[model samples]
Target: SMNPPPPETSNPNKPKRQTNQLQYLLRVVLKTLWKHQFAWPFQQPVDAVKLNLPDYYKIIKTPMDMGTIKKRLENNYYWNAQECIQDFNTMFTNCYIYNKPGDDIVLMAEALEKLFLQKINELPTEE
Candidate 1:
């Protein structure tokens, strides 16, 4: 805490300060990320997504086109709730999971949480 910790004696029940705690946590995470950069060893941009078209790439079949992909996902994909991205869920159909559960946004949050815990479990944390 280079800057003095925001007045330690704040009322917990007050919405203003409670909400501020969430904001503070966000700032801490962002600051830590800036201080120690994250690395992506095996990721590629969509435009420059020059896959060697590996067998796995070809195996991930959804549909023929974006339109069909959307339809198929809606029908086949186990949607829990209205997706966070209603537009993309409706139009693109093929969910691009930039983060977790891999595009099925409704379940992705839970899936991501599970993944985070799983990864944490795998890591050698204690020195």
Candidate 2:
């Protein structure tokens, strides 16, 4: 858990390094995502008003507005943990779908992991 093997290649274009190990990288990323506190929600619900509305534009676009996600959660879109997992899964899957090459897919995963970590830091810690 403490240490995952580093990626063998810095080059995304080369399939040689990532082809076999891509599976390993994916497993680690998903496993860590599920195992960590980032998989959970904030103690306090993120204010719809406070969320960078544009940040979610890819998912819902401008017509949905800021309150969409917040309001959906309030309306029983999901129980807390379920919603948390779904959100990350949605983000990751969309990213992977949009970029369907070996290198681009892995790059997206790297970005997704960092994005989750940054957002997790902003969430309220449980008592």
Candidate 3:
């Protein structure tokens, strides 16, 4: 889960939370997506209930990320936005499959798909 940096108003001299390079990048990406409305899975849903991610989670970093990008580019995800989103959802769900996120991963996948589509829709498209 995202643990934001302490408030700026807090004591400057206070030691900050220790985080590795992977952890730092993770927070940045997650927080940026969240800022852009790509909320954490299960925050809101089509169903009539609430959901939440666990306090902590696991994900393969770096190389797996590169592999996804390479796979998408190799698969022409540049032209097929839907396919790109599908692959993304599949990757995320599978990564967390063995270690499920708090809420229904199916729902989270849907939310993630929607999130990417929304962002993609905002971009300029070929006429």
Candidate 4:
């Protein structure tokens, strides 16, 4: 007859707590960005058809927005903070690429990008 296995103890390498904490911090930063007035343009995916931007899709292959990022975070799609930041950067870059440098939307994206970078820098570092 086969013998029963002993009970397992806590795993020393588990980083569940740290991951949860990072998720929480990321959520806070996302909420702050959503509330900013300049965030409206980047809050949702660009409506190329309605907005009459026929070339938008052609220029922006990887469309990204705050709503998508928030959804991804809620669904645990981001493996780390850098992933989330990359999406944010993609959103900003798309705006810059599709709009003229002096355009209002481009200015808004610039402001939002500055705020995002500032907030990201404010996050607490791992011990």
The top-ranked prediction according to TM-score is: 4
**Model 3 Cα shift for residue 106 (angstroms):** 14
Per-candidate count of clashing residue pairs (backbone under 3 Å): 2, 0, 0, 0
- Model-by-model lDDT, in order? 0.28, 0.38, 0.38, 0.70
Those runs of model 2 whose alpha carbons end farther than 4 Å from true positions after fitting are: 1-71, 74-76, 102-113, 121-127
What is the descending TM-score order?
4, 3, 2, 1
Best by lDDT: 4
Candidate ranking (lDDT, best to worst): 4, 2, 3, 1
Per-residue lDDT over 32-55 for candidate 4, one digit per residue giving the tens place of the 0 to 100 score: 889998887777777777777777
Candidates 2 and 4 compared: the better one by TM-score is 4
Q: Any runs in candidate 1 off by more than 4 Å, and if so which?
A: 1-18, 39-127
Global lDDT for candidate 2?
Answer: 0.38
What would the per-residue lDDT of candidate 3 be over residues 1-127, giving only the tens digit for each residue? 4432321223445433322322322233333344443344323221112224332233322112224433333333333334334444555554365355665655555565565555545544423
Where does candidate 2 clash, by residue pair?
Answer: none
Model 1: per-residue Cα lDDT at residue 95? 28
Q: lDDT by residue for model 2 over 29-90, one digit each (tens)?
A: 33445454433322222323454433333443212211233333333333243333455555
**Model 2 lDDT-worst window of ten:** 1-10
